[PDB]
Design a protein around this nucleic acid. Structure first.
Ligand SMILES: [K+]
Ligand SMILES: [K+]
Ligand SMILES: [K+]
Ligand SMILES: [K+]
Ligand SMILES: [K+]
Ligand SMILES: [Mg+2]
Ligand SMILES: [Mg+2]
Ligand SMILES: [Mg+2]
Ligand SMILES: [Mg+2]
Ligand SMILES: [Mg+2]
Ligand SMILES: [Mg+2]
Ligand SMILES: [Mg+2]
Ligand SMILES: [Mg+2]
Ligand SMILES: [Mg+2]
Ligand SMILES: [Mg+2]
Ligand SMILES: [Mg+2]
Ligand SMILES: [Mg+2]
Ligand SMILES: [Mg+2]
Ligand SMILES: [Mg+2]
Ligand SMILES: [Mg+2]
Ligand SMILES: [Mg+2]
Ligand SMILES: [Mg+2]
Ligand SMILES: [Mg+2]
Ligand SMILES: [Mg+2]
Ligand SMILES: [Mg+2]
Ligand SMILES: [Mg+2]
Ligand SMILES: [Mg+2]
Lengths: 58, 203, 63, 144
RNA sequence: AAGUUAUAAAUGAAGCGGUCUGGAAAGGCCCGCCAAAGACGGUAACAGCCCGGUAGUUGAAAUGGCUUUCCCUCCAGAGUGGAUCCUGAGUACGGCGGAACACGUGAAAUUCCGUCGGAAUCCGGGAGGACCAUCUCCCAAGGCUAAAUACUCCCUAGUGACCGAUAGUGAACCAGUACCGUGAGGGAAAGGUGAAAAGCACCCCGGAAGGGGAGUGAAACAGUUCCUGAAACCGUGUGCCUAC
RNA sequence: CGGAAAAAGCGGAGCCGUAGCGAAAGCGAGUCUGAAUAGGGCGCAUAAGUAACAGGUCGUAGACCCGAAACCAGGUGAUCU
RNA sequence: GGUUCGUGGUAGGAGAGCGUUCUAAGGGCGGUGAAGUCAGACCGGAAGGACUGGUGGAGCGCUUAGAAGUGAGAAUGCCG
């Protein structure tokens, strides 16, 4: 699971609280499964909203 | 002092500076530099395994309680037969160096000690047509050396190292290498005119 | 390796030329209505770390 | 080498603890009996007092370190007697003579002592008194 | 192609010197000798001159590597102008949430991740520890890049004020074995005849084992856990004492 | 760098000390406080350090030796139950 | 070398030494018998060191310095 264009995906960091208790979490990407042309043909692929807001054709 | 050819004939005399050869030696300084050098020589390649390096351990061999055996935590603890060593050796450099002035003084002093003990031999030159331990030994009788000795050379001296290196009590060096230890390790000091001039201008 | 200097001690001591250690007095934050002016004009000064305490802390602020 | 006898009091046999009662360093090995200090790794921090508040925590912090601080190499008058009168002293000269190695942020000449000799001196800052003494010997002063 | 090197090797000085001990001489004593060779090891005991060898000098058919030469391949670079044009966009930054920077949100610069927003683009843009101006230095959002650095399952030659068989690798011996465990996995113990098997022909007791002679050997109280053989331990015998 | 897993030579960058006082600016045999030239604190007067060795001790490292019950991480196990 | 005062000692401080393994140098014994081991009625103020003899059957002391895996009677110690 990763964007086919800019390979952004789940990275990991901490969840901090008041009292600065550190716990562990992941930041997932806003990946949407939509058609694009991978090549001269189409395909239904995970792509990111950032990469999608302008420049890529559904 | 006297100056004599490798034939053993008197060639004349050298004036040796009392800056180097004429001072009173400091035997304490000389000792300290000897030990510095002898201890910088040692290689320090010793090592032993502790309870963390010995292969095994991990299992506690029995319960802390209820067996009647003494409480134990590893089959490789020190008290155990095939077990670890507790501190033991670890690789070390022993090399230490005293100050340069102290070391210069040491060399000046050991040389002047050789002078006072009348164990210098200063000779006009020292050459061999070819490496020939026969000829070198014969020189070592044409000057009544007959003990352990250190030859010091800077001239042409094309074959003298080879013609000496088979002899056990004999050592040869190119006049920069002259050490406190390498001197004291020998009895007599056989220094050529050019070698002494070079040692002078160094010191 | 080399010894780490005690930083809470570095921030509040100071050396002299005799190698002794100077400090500030320590009832001097927030209740000066309950402290005579004779007391405060002295606490605003400095002080020398005592011998018994120096014997304990010298090796934390050797540098 | 068979006669080596180093200086007296330069060397001294290591105390070896825990090798008998006649050594006086035997069984307990200078640790006594049964406490935190008789243990391996035993002891406490250097400024620990039993949970009593340490000295440093019972007194206040003070100050700030300036970043544009200027500290200056401190020269006295006594050194300047080494030079024949009427000559010129400089930072470069004072370094060449090994009086100084570090021009920290500058040179400063202080009136500790006395001169006997007329001199022209130039440096970064002078003390008032040293300026006075240099002039009183007929010297002169420049500020670099 | 040439040279060099590595992977086989070759040649290589000088005492069977005499005598003493001795089971045996390499050792003692007296004579010599060689040495660019007195490193090491072995040989009936401590060998420069007995052996292998060492120093030195030579050499490699074949293969591999390295260094040079050639081939082969491929190669526009200075200047003056500067109409105009280009110079890394969903990034650079910002908000929110986290992290890395010695720097724990702290006044928090700088770098990075996720998500929202979202630039100028040469009279432009960034940094100089919030930030503003000025000054100075520099051109991001594209990529490559040896050397110096780190390590050693391995190969070659060697070193040790390192161990010397409860040490040293767990393992000096057919050891990751036997053995334990369903399994992952844990994990030992155990070296020494003698210079040479010359390893006891033959006889006697005995079913054999094991002995006693004989014999070998310097030695068998060195006889196939075989150099030495401590102490605990087990016994035989006896000088002195001991059953109010 | 040099060189024998050497010894010298080179290397003075830096370190310590020689001047301290002060939060600092800064002043300097004085300095800070303070209105002060006062007194007082710290210094100087009242000048020996430095490099290396060894001994003692302290700190960081397992730090003197042995010893928990427990915690965490990766795996093995339902041939018993 | 003398005079005076002293000379019980745990924790603990201070000092001087004995001994073991190794190294360097000097100088030595040792198959006409080394280390080791066994026995002894010797020596020194102590740790300890010699001598003699037996067994063993090839290496080891002494001296001055140096460096340490440095000296065990106990750890319900570990192995045999
Ligand atoms: K040999
Ligand atoms: K920040
Ligand atoms: K810049
Ligand atoms: K004052
Ligand atoms: K014996
Ligand atoms: Mg472990
Ligand atoms: Mg002692
Ligand atoms: Mg003591
Ligand atoms: Mg005591
Ligand atoms: Mg005891
Ligand atoms: Mg106790
Ligand atoms: Mg108590
Ligand atoms: Mg106590
Ligand atoms: Mg409390
Ligand atoms: Mg023999
Ligand atoms: Mg920025
Ligand atoms: Mg943020
Ligand atoms: Mg952090
Ligand atoms: Mg963001
Ligand atoms: Mg700024
Ligand atoms: Mg054995
Ligand atoms: Mg073993
Ligand atoms: Mg036997
Ligand atoms: Mg009776
Ligand atoms: Mg399973
Ligand atoms: Mg007493
Ligand atoms: Mg021990």
């Amino acid at each position: 699971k990763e964007c086919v264009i800019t390979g952004r995906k789940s990275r990991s960091g901490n969840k901090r609280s008041h009292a600065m208790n550190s716990s562990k979490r992941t930041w997932k990407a806003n990946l949407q499964k939509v058609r694009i042309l991978v090549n001269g043909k189409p395909k239904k692929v995970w792509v990111s909203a950032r990469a999608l807001k302008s420049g890529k054709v559904e | 002092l006297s100056l004599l050819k490798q034939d053993g004939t008197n060639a004349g005399e050298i004036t040796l500076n009392d800056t180097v050869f004429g001072i009173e030696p400091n035997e304490k300084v000389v000792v300290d530099v000897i030990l510095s050098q002898r201890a910088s020589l040692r290689q320090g390649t010793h090592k032993v395994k502790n309870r963390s390096e010995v292969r095994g351990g991990g299992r506690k061999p029995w319960r802390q309680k209820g067996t009647g055996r003494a409480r134990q935590g590893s089959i490789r603890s020190p008290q155990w037969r095939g077990g670890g060593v507790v501190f033991g050796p670890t690789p070390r450099s022993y090399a230490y160096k005293l100050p340069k002035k102290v070391r210069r003084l040491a060399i000046k002093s050991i040389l002047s000690s050789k002078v006072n003990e009348e164990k210098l031999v200063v000779l006009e030159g020292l050459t061999f047509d070819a490496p020939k331990t026969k000829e070198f030994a014969a020189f070592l009788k044409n000057i009544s050396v007959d003990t352990k000795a250190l030859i010091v050379v800077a001239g042409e001296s094309e074959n003298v190292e080879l013609s000496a290196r088979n002899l056990q009590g004999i050592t040869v060096i190119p006049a920069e290498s002259i050490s406190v230890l390498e001197v004291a390790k020998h009895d007599k000091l056989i220094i050529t005119k050019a070698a002494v001039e070079k040692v002078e201008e160094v010191l | 390796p080399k010894m780490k200097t005690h930083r809470g001690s570095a921030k509040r001591f100071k050396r002299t030329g005799s190698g002794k250690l100077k400090r500030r007095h320590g009832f001097t934050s927030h209740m000066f209505a309950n402290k005579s002016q004779k007391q405060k004009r002295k606490l605003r000064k400095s002080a020398m770390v005592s011998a018994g305490d120096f014997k304990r802390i010298r090796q934390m602020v050797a540098k | 080498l068979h006669e080596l006898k180093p200086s007296e009091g330069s060397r001294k046999e290591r105390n070896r603890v825990g090798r008998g009662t006649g050594s006086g360093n035997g069984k307990t090995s200078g640790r006594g009996h049964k406490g935190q200090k008789a243990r391996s790794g035993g002891g406490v921090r250097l400024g620990f007092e039993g949970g009593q508040l340490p000295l440093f925590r019972r007194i206040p912090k003070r100050g700030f370190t300036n970043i544009n601080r200027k500290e200056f190499a401190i020269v006295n008058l006594d050194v300047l007697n080494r030079f024949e009168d009427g000559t010129e002293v400089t930072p470069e000269l004072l370094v060449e003579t090994g009086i100084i190695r570090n021009e920290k942020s500058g040179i400063k000449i202080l009136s500790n002592g006395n001169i006997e000799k007329k001199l022209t001196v130039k440096a970064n800052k002078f003390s008032a008194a040293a300026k006075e003494a240099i002039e009183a010997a007929g010297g002169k002063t420049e500020v670099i």
